[PDB]
């Protein structure tokens, strides 16, 4: 998870 994990 931390914060979404899947392009950023």
């Known amino acids: 998870x931390x914060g979404x994990x899947?392009?950023?």
């Open 6 to 8: 899947g392009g950023c």
